Amino acid sequence: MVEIDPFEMAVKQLERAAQYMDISEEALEWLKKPMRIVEVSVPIEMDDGSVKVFTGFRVQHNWARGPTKGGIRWHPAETLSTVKALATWMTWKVAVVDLPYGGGKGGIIVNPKELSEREQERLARAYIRAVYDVIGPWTDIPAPDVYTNPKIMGWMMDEYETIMRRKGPAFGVITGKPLSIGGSLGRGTATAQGAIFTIREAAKALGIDLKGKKIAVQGYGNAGYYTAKLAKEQLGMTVVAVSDSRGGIYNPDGLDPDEVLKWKREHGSVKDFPGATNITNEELLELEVDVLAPAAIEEVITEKNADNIKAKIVAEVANGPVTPEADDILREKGILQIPDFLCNAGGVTVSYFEWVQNINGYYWTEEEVREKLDKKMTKAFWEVYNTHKDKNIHMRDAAYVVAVSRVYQAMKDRGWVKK
Numbered sequence: 001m002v003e004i005d006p007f008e009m010a011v012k013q014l015e016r017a018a019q020y021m022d023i024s025e026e027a028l029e030w031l032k033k034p035m036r037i038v039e040v041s042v043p044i045e046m047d048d049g050s051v052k053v054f055t056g057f058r059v060q061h062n063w064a065r066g067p068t069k070g071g072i073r074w075h076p077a078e079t080l081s082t083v084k085a086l087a088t089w090m091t092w093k094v095a096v097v098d099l100p101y102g103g104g105k106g107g108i109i110v111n112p113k114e115l116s117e118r119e120q121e122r123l124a125r126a127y128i129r130a131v132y133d134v135i136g137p138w139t140d141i142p143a144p145d146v147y148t149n150p151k152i153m154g155w156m157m158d159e160y161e162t163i164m165r166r167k168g169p170a171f172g173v174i175t176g177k178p179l180s181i182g183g184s185l186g187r188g189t190a191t192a193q194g195a196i197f198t199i200r201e202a203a204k205a206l207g208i209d210l211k212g213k214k215i216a217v218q219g220y221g222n223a224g225y226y227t228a229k230l231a232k233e234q235l236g237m238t239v240v241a242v243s244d245s246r247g248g249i250y251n252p253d254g255l256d257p258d259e260v261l262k263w264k265r266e267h268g269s270v271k272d273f274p275g276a277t278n279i280t281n282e283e284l285l286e287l288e289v290d291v292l293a294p295a296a297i298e299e300v301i302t303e304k305n306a307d308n309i310k311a312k313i314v315a316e317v318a319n320g321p322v323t324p325e326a327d328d329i330l331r332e333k334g335i336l337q338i339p340d341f342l343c344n345a346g347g348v349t350v351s352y353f354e355w356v357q358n359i360n361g362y363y364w365t366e367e368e369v370r371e372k373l374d375k376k377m378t379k380a381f382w383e384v385y386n387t388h389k390d391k392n393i394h395m396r397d398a399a400y401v402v403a404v405s406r407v408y409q410a411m412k413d414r415g416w417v418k419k
């Protein structure tokens, strides 16, 4: 259902942004192709006793800066191109906030809503058994993503530890784990906290007081719900509309995120929430708000609605929710955009913190994680902002100049590319 191919779009963005920097042709060709792709068959036993084979992908795009990092997406509409694009974005995501990581991603073409608990556990364990040879605490560190949660992360960690015979830091093979089995404090609200920090910095740059303003959030998952909650709590914002895959609810007077979450859990969706009006995702994206945070499937803003966006700041919590064309239209409209791999870099940052805690065997507190995350996100955002201001270019491009250059430097320090 995607407007354009995700990997093609990602490559187009990379070229469009490399047009504003000095990079050799060979380095560009290296960066336009994932470094390793592994397609595996994942066989599991269903509840009725039959054996079903799913398709799994583990794509690492580059590991010049360090071990690759990226979540695992469970999605019926997933394609290898989507995983390649996500790994490519992961690379820039970890480069922009200066982490010793490369870019990676994983996925399974499956509808998890049709799978039971035992089937989900079997699927996670079989995926680990399939991709064990390309993952590790120093090779490839998976994490939670769309339709995956810390539960599945703990199952995957247990399977990896069983295969690995407890020879090294198995806890560090995967992030977003439960706190009991080597989890990190603040990882649950990581991406939301990073998005909130970036929104606050953007408002500071734009000279806008966020108290009493309006935020519309698309998607009510681990990122969308926590983003709405933190915006209502920390920034003093008024959440006027939320949504999920079945539709959204809008309220001019504001919504309480906890009640909406309870209604969603007790009914399966946020639709027909009391005191709110049912709308579509297309209608929510077009609402008159001060901040719009897409936290759902990619490619939600295209030439079919780019001119209808009326938000002062668009916080791309999701991975690649805006097309380059739509980026040009929004920039022509004077709308500030927080780039996708900079806005939601808080999640990968706290995942890096969890990995450090796991490999060192020493765990931090909430305050330390909160301070380090704030420091990293503020530095990265201000670097990207000053970059886009000095060169008079789009935000997305500027972050690329901040990110790709670092990656480029790594290759020149490894001898991968001579020029």
Ligand SMILES: NC(=O)C1=CN([C@@H]2O[C@H](COP(=O)(O)OP(=O)(O)OC[C@H]3O[C@@H](n4cnc5c(N)ncnc54)[C@H](OP(=O)(O)O)[C@@H]3O)[C@@H](O)[C@H]2O)C=CC1
Residues within 6 Å of the ligand: 071, 144, 145, 146, 147, 148, 191, 218, 219, 220, 221, 222, 223, 224, 243, 244, 245, 246, 268, 269, 281, 295, 296, 297, 298, 317, 318, 319, 344, 347, 348
């Ligand atoms: N997973 C993570 O920890 C983080 C994720 N990201 C990126 O952010 C995005 C969202 O992740 P996350 O918040 O965890 O998602 P979740 O796994 O928590 O849940 C998905 C939510 O988004 C909804 N959704 C999926 N597709 C659509 C759609 N087309 N339209 C409207 N709502 C939709 C789902 O609806 P419903 O509930 O009805 O099924 C659900 O509400 C992803 O692209 C991800 O890669 C980066 C930061 C960390």
Ligand SMILES: O=C(O)CCC(=O)C(=O)O
Residues within 6 Å of the ligand: 069, 070, 071, 072, 093, 141, 142, 143, 144, 145, 175, 319, 344, 347, 348, 349, 351
């Ligand atoms: O935290 C991680 O390592 C994965 C995060 C992720 O999947 C993403 O940022 O898209």
Ligand SMILES: O=C(O)CCC(=O)C(=O)O
Residues within 6 Å of the ligand: 112, 113, 145, 146, 147, 148, 149, 221, 222
């Ligand atoms: O991402 C989550 O928080 C849970 C994902 C989910 O709802 C699912 O696996 O069906």
Ligand SMILES: [N+]
Residues within 6 Å of the ligand: 191, 344, 345, 346, 347, 348, 349
């Ligand atoms: N992230």
